[model samples]
Target: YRYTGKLRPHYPLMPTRPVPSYIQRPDYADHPLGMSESEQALKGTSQIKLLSSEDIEGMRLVCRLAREVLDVAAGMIKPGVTTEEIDHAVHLACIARNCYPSPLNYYNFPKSCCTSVNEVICHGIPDRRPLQEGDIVNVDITLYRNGYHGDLNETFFVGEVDDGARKLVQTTYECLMQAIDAVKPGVRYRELGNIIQKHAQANGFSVVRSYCGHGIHKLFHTAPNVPHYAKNKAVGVMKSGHVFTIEPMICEGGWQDETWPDGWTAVTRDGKRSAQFEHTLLVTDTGCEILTRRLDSARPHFMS
Candidate 1:
């Protein structure tokens, strides 16, 4: 297929990985086409869920597991490692923890996790391509355990990278953090776009408008669409029990993007570069809690 970037999807993906029968699975686990009947029913509801104390505890446990899986995936990320290898590692990590890899078959996503490299904005499926030196790849992971889902992703440097790559990555993370800092009761969901876009634009980057964060809990993707660009029409307000993610996709060129024929991968139209970071958070009375906060040594060293 004709694509704008230097990267191409490696076709005939590795055979679908299996989850142990003992692990509890999401509603879409066994469908022939991986459709989630539960998710389809929840569409267009516009209802935001408030987690009970028990639900919050469930979120904490699952979010921690998601972080561990992401760390395993990130550790395998260096020059010459294929994203398929990373996907296998993520699958094993999730099963080892007795959790289900949420991305597997969620609306028919082929891979267990998303590995978007270079100009790919998001949903870049894992494939046979070996990551090259200086390439930046975003590894997005979500796991379901004990009836809750924890979602988060981080972009990693393949090896040594130029200044432009480093700057774009660091700035993308900063946008996510700055937006997280503003999560308190009564904050408009629309306001996060302003916080993210302001930081991205000041750094000469642009925020991707095609994708937005969403409320996640018992459901993998739900209400409270969190747009990352300024002046968006996103609805809802922050509340103490709200659990969601704020992932901003920042582009080094024009914010415009085009999706591959595969129907999942989205890439920057100008083929320059893009970076993203995500965290599942819980709103608290005073401020918020980052359920998927980076472990002490989990952060990419250059980020410090």
Candidate 2:
């Protein structure tokens, strides 16, 4: 019933058995403790998984298509638009590119993309809810093209938002940007935590420790989970040809989060607002390239 014939059952792509409660609905009460554990254990990790140049090129193309879908869907955002309508836009965009909407059946997610509205942290299923002024929503887009996948997301203001909401969204974006800027060859993947966490704390915000970025290329999520907290040890060393995402989930209050009974939507434990941004990147010989970069004609930045 949760699915609307647009997706398949959660089998094969994911375990057929009920998803582990921890993976489906994580408890973020241990945010501080978890941060300490990541800090300690992530330093010695190295990205040893080798990918061919052809594979990297294919992933770059997928990233570009994913960005295009996101841009088209974002253009449809406005007052009185339903989340389901957003899903339709996303579905059409993917089909237009002759690609498959990755989320549609991967893990049995019904929607083409996740539409996380205000207070709904993540994995929000598309619904009848109409976007209202001052609301913040995160649109997570992923697509499979040419035997590869690309994933990215962003938080946008509904209409006119309050100062607190605006700041939360802005800070969350900066956290991701700062984290991406720190990525370079030979850099410890765990070191990104310091840069992201410090920025959030300095701005009086907190990073959601429950979810972190991941190794995203041909297999969707592979290895080397990227945590965006300071002083945390996340496994892996960044090397050329490494492709992944560095999304940081930021909240206006405590970093802890909770999930709804339906099992996918995450929300702030304190009931405060949350925001996030994501990008698919490739670590090159010299630096990183954002494969999902927005076109120059698109909105220049997050601000309205």
Candidate 3:
């Protein structure tokens, strides 16, 4: 009760399984250590994949599909809904779109979608625990199709939320929009963190540093790891055809986290509140395109 967020992971989780044979979860970690692309993904650099017109079109399709999956999952959030229920719905939604849920076996992730509730900043594994009335959770969705990946996520209110919880979620989303507006040709990837960190700190919240955004498209995870904190050393400058995600995980306490025994869930070390918003973007000559764009009115605003 200290952090006003309770999350216990004693429930069982499903293991990886076959999904229509077309959906294969490639584990880059199991591959040879000297692989060129894997080595390049180790650190952010300009050598990142720059998609083509056809690739961008494929990304647009997959991104829209993921956006819809995320929206539908959010729609299922309520006091009595289990995260496993949310995961099952996301799984079906991806199938209906002819896309594979990217997280199915990703690094041994046991679920199709990530439901990070309350203190869990990100990578919260789906389980049988029912969402509570005052809970706020982030649903992260990614789909693979046409040889590319589309990723996005949004935090939603399970039922009623307090002022403290309401303020943090709203600020986290605005921080994402401000960073996107700063993207343009030649803008350094490192600079985006400044804008995000500025907003989070000004509002008396802390930014999670354990996990950051990364490149996605043809490969599951690749170049230009993005940090949503101040003075990050992320490499490369934005160029047309470059695509990546800008997701900020901010907490109500210190910017520190601890991994749950499941070895996947990352919860705030102090057990305080945390919320995240994510979107895949493509760099344009003048600015950036939100490949996973949702109509402003489409997003739900929690009533405090």
lDDT of 2 by residue, 142-209 (tens): 88777677999988887888989878887888888888887889999889889988999999998888
Candidate 2 residue runs with Cα over 4 Å from true position: 1-48, 297-301
lDDT of 2 at 84: 79
Which candidate model has the greater TM-score, 2 or 3? 3
Q: Rate the local accuracy (lDDT) of all candidates.
A: 0.92, 0.75, 0.83
Superposition error at 165 for model 1 (Å): 0.3
The window of 10 residues in a row where model 3 has the poorest summed lDDT is 27-36
What does candidate 3's lDDT look like per residue over 1-304, in tens digits?
2332467974775554346755543443224431335435565444677888999998999998888898798778889898888898899888788878888766557788899998999999888898889999889999988777899998998777899989999999999999999999889999989999999999999998889988888776788788999998888888889999999999999999888767888889888999999999999987999988886555544432
Q: Which ten-residue region of model 1 has the weakest summed lDDT?
A: 295-304
The Cα error of candidate 1 at residue 15, in Å, is: 0.9
Error of 2 at 264 (Å): 0.6
RMSD for each of the candidates: 1.3, 9.5, 3.3
> What TM-score fits each model?
0.97, 0.83, 0.90
Of 2 and 3, which scores higher on lDDT? 3
**In model 3, how many backbone clashes occur?**
0
Work out how many backbone clashes candidate 1 has.
0
Kindly report which residue stretches of model 3 are placed more than 4 angstroms away from their true locations once superposed.
1-5, 14-17, 22-46, 295-304
Better of 1 and 2 by TM-score: 1
